[PDB]
Symmetry: D2
Subunit: 421 residues, 4 copies
């Protein structure tokens, strides 16, 4: 531990490798590059203090450095104990971000470090999973009045915060960044679709083609995971609790059945529900020898590990990010990444170009809070759609794509009723 008042990291001497990772991914993040250039000229966060709980790898680092280049004083804590990249965090510490995170930290350290990040007395909180916003309401009420607002990156976080609002406990405005179009249609679907399979392949070196792949949940993440599994040659089976989404999965060409039926025939299981105990004791009891299980949802409760432990006569670790649960009849079941987001724990998270768009929205949400806090209520808001459209337009221009535009005649037609057959 290289720990001080301003940071706590595993080893500062890793910083040089961290910088290479940050410099690499930033070359492929044009929207955030555009924003950073604007932030550098206008310094909109001069005097502003920002605390962030995010997955601390390269792309996050580039967002945090973008906020800092806009004048912000920035602190950071891990969103997940096992998603932190120690070399990237050393680099952030060297850049003057007040970061407290060590890969594999305990649950107690996780909370201690999050408290240290809060010690900056933030005006803006950027969160991923809602633990930091939740922690401020539960244990750090003294600084509610300093806080202009928070933004939340993920589906699980937004559900928590909307529940806080309904119960009348939310004390400051929150931007649900997850609910922007340029987030959930891209990150949740295309990002998770690719990076889940990157993580699974990386941990296992197994063939995806000709496998029965069971995807639990057919929301934005699940449909991305399913689509990319099919793209890699798998036979995909979807498990859902919503009848409309179940039918969508069928029409998309996938088998649909319940969790017990899927447990009997799955080779690889991926959860993307954001829910608790989607796979549990009775499913593990049905699984084939050698079943691989991974979780893409935010918290490690989707696949219920206490149930696996109770069934197991031995728990082994045959590979990094593979835990073997050997059962009484000799079947071996494999859990990847200790049941935590497999894309972030067994790989490098979403690809750079996806987090570009998500984190461009995050940067703009911070700016929106700065610019609007005095007129917002303690409620959950969504960014105006004009920000989504601006992010899409910068991205399209960076790809060299020029699209058609609506003529005036066309706009008037679409606002008319008289033009029938």
């Amino acid at each position: 531990m290289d720990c001080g008042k301003d940071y706590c990291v595993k080893d500062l001497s890793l910083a040089e490798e961290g910088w290479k990772k940050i410099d690499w991914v930033s070359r492929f993040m044009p929207v955030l590059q555009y924003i950073k250039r604007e932030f550098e000229e206008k310094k909109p966060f001069k005097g502003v203090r920002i605390a962030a709980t995010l997955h601390l790898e390269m792309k996050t680092a580039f967002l945090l450095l973008t906020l800092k280049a806009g004048g912000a004083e920035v602190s950071a804590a891990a969103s997940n104990p096992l998603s932190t990249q120690d070399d990237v965090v050393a680099a952030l510490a060297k850049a003057g971000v007040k970061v407290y995170a060590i890969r594999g930290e305990s649950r107690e350290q996780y909370y201690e470090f999050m408290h240290k990040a809060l010690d900056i007395r933030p005006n803006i909180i950027i969160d991923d999973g809602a633990d930091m916003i939740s922690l401020v309401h539960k244990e750090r009420q003294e600084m509610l009045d300093e806080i202009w607002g928070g933004s939340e990156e993920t589906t699980t976080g937004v559900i928590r915060l909307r529940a806080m609002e309904k119960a009348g406990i939310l004390k400051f405005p929150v931007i649900a960044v997850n609910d922007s179009y340029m987030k959930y249609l891209f990150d949740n679907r295309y990002g998770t679709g690719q990076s889940t399979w990157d993580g699974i392949m990386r941990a296992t070196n197994l063939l995806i083609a000709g496998k029965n792949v069971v995807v639990v949940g057919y929301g934005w993440c699940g449909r991305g995971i399913a689509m990319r599994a099919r793209g890699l040659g798998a036979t995909v089976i979807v498990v859902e609790v919503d009848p409309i989404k179940a039918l969508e999965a069928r029409m998309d060409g996938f088998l649909v059945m319940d969790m017990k039926e899927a447990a009997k025939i799955g080779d690889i299981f991926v959860t993307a529900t954001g829910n608790i105990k989607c796979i549990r004791r009775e499913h593990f009891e049905l699984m084939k020898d050698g079943a691989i299980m991974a979780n893409a949802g935010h918290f490690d409760v989707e696949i219920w590990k206490p149930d696996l432990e109770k069934l197991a006569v031995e728990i082994n670790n045959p590979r990094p990010n593979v835990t073997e649960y050997k059962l009484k009849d000799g079947r071996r079941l494999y859990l990847l990444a200790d049941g935590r987001l497999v894309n972030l724990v067994a790989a490098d998270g979403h690809p750079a170009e996806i987090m570009d768009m998500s984190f461009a929205l995050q940067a703009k949400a911070a700016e929106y809070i700065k610019d609007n806090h005095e007129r917002l209520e303690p409620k959950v808001y969504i960014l105006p759609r004009e920000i989504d459209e601006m992010v899409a337009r910068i991205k399209l221009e960076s790809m060299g794509i020029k699209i058609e535009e609506l003529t005036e005649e066309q706009k008037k037609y679409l606002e008319s009723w008289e033009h029938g057959t």
Copy 2:
């Protein structure tokens, strides 16, 4: 020829073949079969008069006969002059539906027949395109106070009616059936995806694989058309005006460019915009010899025919549903189905199982209007989502699919905010 007070059809002696078509598709329409059984027992439309403007083929006939089995007196007019199937209409006339439609009728006959359908003095109007609702407001104001409400099947119709609302001229409640989940996610996407290519293949006998297919519009219809073109081995190019949708198309694996660029390289062009003049003079001037053009949108204004006519030195008709425009330099450009919905004119429309779900929603919308008209304003409404879920559950049960159900613990988890790391 067979034309009186109660109906107007080409030839009643076609009825036998009409009945066979109706009986066939109804075997594969379980949701509407379920509803029909309920309507037959409870007769919710006893005493009620319903006028419908729909595409008059066999699935429509089954909806209209279902309404009649619920006790309704039913009239009907074509939604499109060229979508009518004369044999199905003969059967409807023999069943006592007051139907006025001849395939290939003129624009003036279309309106005369629509007026004849209105002569029933409807309580409920079921519309597809909003011409009948528009016609009642513009030319048949005498019967407005008899009308409880209307329902509208299609995107183009809903836009017209929302424009009528904004202008303060809408005089009764309208249900935007198009905006239900079980409609636009299934009909607009999967239905149009299949039946567009059915119609193009049927009209042309040409190969889809290894063609450059240009899809104009990447909404629900366009993404279904694109998806199925790719599934048939085409190289798909998407043209869009909305930056977010353009980026979605790129991430789905498709080229994105503007209409002039796409005009130079397209082999087959399909419009799905619901807009005017998406393809016009300067595009036709760029097209390759032998380009095929089709429209999947509601009205025949998407591909601007007056422009083709002005470019043409000859207009020929080499096949049913193919118009050849021979240009000065000798290039020949082909328009399918006279630029009208290609799925409905060159083929048999959406497949039975799709219209099952759309028309189940139509049946439920008619019932919703009956039940609730008194408490609705002269505005556009959307059916409660509970109806969508009920339609999805009946369909899943008919497919023999049993999905997972949420535990109580799970429902509480999803409503909680305290459960973090």
Copy 3:
């Protein structure tokens, strides 16, 4: 019947509609257009007599007219009683092709007409299924000495002829056109893939997406049918007898099981085996109510109709090209196109651009026989690959595609062994 010495057709007055079909498809057949222009200038078949057994629709007509434009006297008989298009054959009769074919002709007429075609005393026989070549060996031995050679279009035909060779009964050279690359990789795969689903959709108006589609046989036809079913949103199940092909199907993302297992869960069954009794009594007994069955193989023996008839308490005809077999328990099973090639009987066969390439090979095979008969043995041969490459090059040039070419350096590298690490 308009029958004479020179032809036998249903009705000559259909010719005008026939010509429109022929003129249409020929516009999209560039390779055969190229060949026809060469044949017209060089007249390589001046004095030559050609008898053909092919599926008598538009594209075939254009091949036969191409041979005639090369100077050939041409006769023709149906390859299948139900694939004949009466209007196209009227046109051929009017053009001076000696064609004997009526759609729906009996098995006795089929043989009588084939004998009439043979009465031209052919130098070259073009066959599809090997019935005409077989008939000459069995019943018309007098004219073996006149015959330079035969070509065979299809997999089933080639197997028959290779069996004739092995048994020492083949009496003249045969070109296995089916075995050319530009045939089986394109026609058998991409052609059958599209046109099978065209035929199924056309006959039924049912949804392909979210159906369990069972494909029996995973050869060139089967893999095309499977690939396009998946492309239309089906869940595809493959039944195979070859273990290597079964594994290929699994790795392509399809379920693989035996015929009894597939019979229990299939919604739509398609046979492409070229074999006998692939689906028979015990499979029909397992099928779900409303199962649709179609055959894509050459002969109607793949789905064993005598078994369906024995199980049925009623046989009905609810639609053209749909036969209903109603079983004792009330289940209804539907056979399309009377179990004959569904693409040709319920639709218009392969698309024009595919038959362009197949029939360009047929034209070149006729020319190869003309040019080589005196040096060939009574064996089955395959066209030199240079003809395949020439067909591919003409097609690519007609699409405006210019490919890379091998440099001399590269050719030498590929012929070297010394250049290692």
Copy 4:
């Protein structure tokens, strides 16, 4: 460091992690497990000496240990300097395999180690790329008469050996393992398809979806790479020199153009030609800023590095397995894995289940050489197809898949010629 008569490896203390990798992948290699059980009982290689040049990762290790369990004395050298996994090699040395390989070894060490492996005086040579077979003929002629035969794993190797045969310099029989069905249809296509993208993702953390991916070569490897790129949401462009393969790519839904056209629009370039200078100076000059380039072919000559070096004003190394060539105008072009097989250098090679089947064929080829060398000429042979079928049947049984079997009536039908219409 740990380098003596019997082996040469980086560090023996890595062996523990090597053994874990070997044990892991072997759990998913049922065909080779089956063979190993037979080899252990029958010891077919007792007294036999085998030298192998293969990519030295864990699946290879399992093949080599299988040969050893069959009684063989085994030596091994790297097939590529950068594919070696140091921990796996340590484990092989501890198991008594005479292995000489250090990851990152120079070209001269590569040859020195290959000579050390040859010092065992092999009866059988197992080769990947043909360098070891080539080396024995060129520099170790003294031991030719000890050598019964060689087997060759890869396409590039087989071409070299067929060139050696043609030149009359091949001195012993070679089995072209690459040419077995269960190799090129599975390894070359499905294996390379997955592991190429695994390696590109791992090296770069970039998004595949919505990229223009240029695949150079549309053979078995290229069609697998293209198929999986499309499955990951890329727009795929194929470059080919063979007109038939170019047309296949078009029908598969991909753009086809020449290398200069593709150079202008590609985002990611992957070569799979087995040829020299497919991408060279004039292509690099056309490439967009940030283009990524990777090679999937055997040798690093496909992308011509000397050309990049001459264009570059700086060569940097921003990531492991990424080389940056910064050009005069400021564009940066990135080459992955120093232009060497990207799947094996930037990742872990083909997945376990694929190498199971390829290496099962290798084991059977070694046995075939042992059993039959006396009756083979100094030529290139292909394994009897019965071995392919046996490998496929063991795999299917391990997957729990039971396929249809042919009846006797069916077998007779397929051998008959009399059964026509």
